[PDB]
Amino acid sequence: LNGTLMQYFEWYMPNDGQHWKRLQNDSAYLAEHGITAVWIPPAYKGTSQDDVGYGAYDLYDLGEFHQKGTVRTKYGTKGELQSAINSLHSRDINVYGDVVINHKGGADATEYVTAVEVDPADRNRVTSGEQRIKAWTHFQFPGRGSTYSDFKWYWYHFDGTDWDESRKLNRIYKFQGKAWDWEVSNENGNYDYLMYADIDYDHPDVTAEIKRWGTWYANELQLDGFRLDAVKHIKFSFLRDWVNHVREKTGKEMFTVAEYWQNDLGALENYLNKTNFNHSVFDVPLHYQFHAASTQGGGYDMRKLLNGTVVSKHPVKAVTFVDNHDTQPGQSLESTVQTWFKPLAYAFILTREAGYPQIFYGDMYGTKGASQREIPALKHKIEPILKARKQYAYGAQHDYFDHHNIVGWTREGDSSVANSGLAALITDGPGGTKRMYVGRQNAGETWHDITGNRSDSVVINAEGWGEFHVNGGSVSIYVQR
């Protein structure tokens, strides 16, 4: 009954074209461990075969056309993806597609464009007169032709770019007659511009086309929902309308979660408000708290985990997580939750009632970057916690955030899930004990630590309390034997 998301990729997976096949072959394992939805990496042609997917060359090429030196994407072919999705749906696993509509990379040809430079710390400030640049803005899709869509892109569909090919120069250029979109993040004055050619969401043909593509994409892959990339760089009212549009055309719920990357609840709440709460956001602040706790050696006040997060104020609109492809070692938003703390963070997201939790492929299977700082495979430490969620994390919750280090929570169980109920303890410092209430209805049951970290059994007293133990820097989750 509890739903669990999985981000089904990490940044450094090998470019062998086998990822979709792997996903298909992992569907039985995912279903058995209680994963009910997967977020798949962008499925369309990037700027090269080894693009992780955020280049977004051709949104209508799902690994079907020979473009950018390849038919397949990094991950495989359209057919392979569709076979994987078909296996996942056969096991009631929903599929959320990644939607990268901020920009387009890898244009087929340059165009001469009149532009001005803007200040990278304040993109509202113009720092040059008009100049002629060669911008990568012409998309003809020579390998695709007009199959699925005859829409061609030119400079006038974009607000700007970060490269002039004539002078070989990396600067933020705003095209003549264009204005950065609003509302976007107010960081750097206006954070519309991120990378590649920035899509102009003031352009009515562009808004129409991206909405149309949205519906096509959903149908083509039989998607159940969306993950929205880089939303702080995309006109908020457009995103709102886009989500409503695809829902209207497909007739389905299309659960949607946006990646709004800011460690600030206020900014996330503004975004929710400006999109009428029609979709969820990732709980970025909670991730940063996990990161802080993991790097402070016991010095973090664990009571802080209850405040300043999306899940603390808008639990129905939070997707909670520990790490992702941007926070993993080496990557652009690097803030990795250290290995020792990572299971404790997973207990917090998986066994508490608030939020829609997500597990990271990189945490399960490890990351394959070229460093000696990669995330090791933690599948065996995470499996028990997933099981706790799937089978035990039901009913009324009681919180025990009453200590700088050792914090815990219980779940009473629900009569709809047989033998459900748990008692969780995590500590960033020394271990110890906490007496916690698990419900009088559990009186006399014998509970054991599903993680195997503690070998002691705890018998629940007549008043519904047990005396629970946790080791130093560890997690224990007690459930009925």
Ligand X SMILES: OC[C@H]1O[C@@H]2O[C@H]3[C@H](O)[C@@H](O)[C@@H](O[C@H]4[C@H](O)[C@@H](O)[C@@H](O[C@H]5[C@H](O)[C@@H](O)[C@@H](O[C@H]6[C@H](O)[C@@H](O)[C@@H](O[C@H]7[C@H](O)[C@@H](O)[C@@H](O[C@H]8[C@H](O)[C@@H](O)[C@@H](O[C@H]1[C@H](O)[C@H]2O)O[C@@H]8CO)O[C@@H]7CO)O[C@@H]6CO)O[C@@H]5CO)O[C@@H]4CO)O[C@@H]3CO
Alpha helices in 296-415 (DSSP H): 310-313, 342-351, 361-365, 379-387
Residue 280 makes contact with ligand X by CB under 6 A: yes
Q: Which is nearer to Na ion, 26 or 198 (CB)?
A: 198
- Out of Ca ion, Na ion, ligand X, none, what residue 333 binds, judged by CB under 5 to 8 A for its kind, is none
Q: How far is the CB of 207 from ligand X (least distance, A)?
A: 24
DSSP, residue by residue, 164-192: BTTTTB---EEETT----SSS--TTS---
Residue 192 among known ligand-binding residues: yes
Helix H or strand E segment including 96: strand 94-99
Residue 207 makes contact with ligand X by CB under 6 A: no
Residue 264 among known ligand-binding residues: no
Touching ligand X, residues 354-393 (CB under 6 A): 354-356
DSSP, residue by residue, 414-451: -TTSTT--EEEEEESS--EEEEEE--GGGTT-EEEETT
Residue 205 among known ligand-binding residues: no
Residue 412 makes contact with Ca ion by CB under 5 A: no
Which residues lie near Na ion (CB under 5 A)?
159, 181, 192, 198, 298, 300, 302, 404-405, 428-429
259 counts as catalytic: yes
**Residue choice 4, 27, 94, 102 for contact with Ca ion (CB under 5 A):** 102
* Residue keyed to tokens 């917090």: 348
Judged by DSSP in three states, 100 sits in: coil
Strands 197-199 and 158-161: antiparallel
Residue 298 among known ligand-binding residues: yes
Q: How far is the CB of 354 from ligand X (least distance, A)?
A: 4
DSSP, residue by residue, 188-241: TS-----SSEEE-TT-HHHHHHHHHHHHHHHHHHT-SEEEETTGGGS-HHHHHH
Helix H or strand E segment including 269: helix 265-274
* Binding window for ligand X (CB under 6 A); candidates: 82-90, 137-145, 234-242, 310-318: 310-318
Residue 456 among known ligand-binding residues: no
- Out of Na ion, Ca ion, ligand X, none, what residue 202 binds, judged by CB under 5 to 8 A for its kind, is Ca ion
> Is the distance from CB of 427 to CB of 404 less than 8 angstroms?
no
Chain centre distance of CA 355: 14
Residue 198 among known ligand-binding residues: yes
**Residue choice 109, 179, 316, 459 for contact with ligand X (CB under 6 A):** 316
283 counts as catalytic: no
* Residue keyed to tokens 């939607």: 99
Residues within the interface to Ca ion (CB under 5 A) = 102, 159, 179, 181, 192, 198, 200, 202, 233
Binding positions for ligand X, rule: CB under 6 A = 280, 315-317, 353-356
* Known binding positions for Ca(2+): 102, 159, 179, 181, 192, 198, 200, 202, 233, 298, 428
